[PDB]
Amino acid sequence: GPLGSGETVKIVRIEKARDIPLGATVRNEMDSVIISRIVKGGAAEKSGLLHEGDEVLEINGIEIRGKDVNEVFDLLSDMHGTLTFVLIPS
Amino acid sequence: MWNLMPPPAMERLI
Ligand SMILES: CC(C)CC(C)(C)CC(C)(C)CC(C)(C)C
Ligand SMILES: [Cl-]
Ligand SMILES: [Cl-]
Ligand SMILES: [Cl-]
Ligand SMILES: [Cl-]
Ligand SMILES: [Cl-]
Ligand SMILES: [Cl-]
Ligand SMILES: [Cl-]
Ligand code: NA
């Protein structure tokens, strides 16, 4: 710091229902995918484990870094069950 | 100001 991506990752498990969004939004900062806002009452809020500024590296073994958020949107819409996120916390 | 500022990043729901 300030250079380089640091010495920590955070792994979180969150339950997603079929065909219902987890209730978090994402944006790109270039290749990266960053949690932006949280839906009130949704699975992400209830978990307390996803926050603004968290960078999503991987979900369930899928490399998320480098994807446009339009691609991430489509991928997550096809997922359910326990999702394991690998994050760089804000 | 309305012209030098960077535009908002696109946001998508997951
Ligand atoms: C956890 C299990 C009881 C549910 C299932 C994964 C086998 C089925 C599902 C209904 C939740 C999956 C799907 C929505 C894709 C049809
Ligand atoms: Cl850097
Ligand atoms: Cl660090
Ligand atoms: Cl942590
Ligand atoms: Cl389900
Ligand atoms: Cl469902
Ligand atoms: Cl849900
Ligand atoms: Cl969206
Ligand atoms: Na789907």
Author numbering:
A (entry chain A): 246 to 335
B (entry chain B): 1393 to 1406
Q: What do the study's own words say?
A:
A single Pals1PDZ–Crb17 complex is present within the asymmetric unit. The Pals1PDZ adopts a canonical PDZ fold consisting of two β-sheets flanked by two α-helices. The total buried surface area between Pals1PDZ and Crb17 is ∼500 Å2. Leu321 of Pals1 adopts a strained side-chain rotamer on binding the ligand, allowing the side chain of Ile1406 from Crb17 to point into a deep hydrophobic pocket in Pals1PDZ. Van der Waals contacts between Crb17 Leu1405 and Pals1 Pro266 stabilize a closed carboxylate-binding loop enveloping the peptide ligand. Charged interactions with the ERLI motif are also found; Crb17 Glu1403 forms a salt bridge with Pals1PDZ Arg282 and also forms hydrogen bonds to the side chains of Thr270 and Ser281. In contrast, in the presence of the Crb17 peptide Phe318 swings out of the pocket to pack against the Arg1404 side chain of Crb17. Overall, the structure explains the tight conservation of each side chain of the Crb ERLI motif through selective interactions with the Pals1PDZ domain, consistent with the binding affinities measured in solution by fluorescence polarization. Our structure of a Crb17 peptide ligand bound to the Pals1 PDZ domain explains the basis for this conservation and presents detailed charged side-chain interactions, carboxylate-binding loop contacts and hydrophobic pockets for the penultimate two Crb residues.
Apical localization of the Crumbs (Crb) transmembrane protein requires a PDZ-mediated interaction with Pals1 (protein-associated with Lin7, Stardust, MPP5), a member of the p55 family of membrane-associated guanylate kinases (MAGUKs). Pals1 belongs to the MPP family of proteins (membrane protein, palmitoylated), also known as the p55 subfamily of membrane-associated guanylate kinases (MAGUKs).
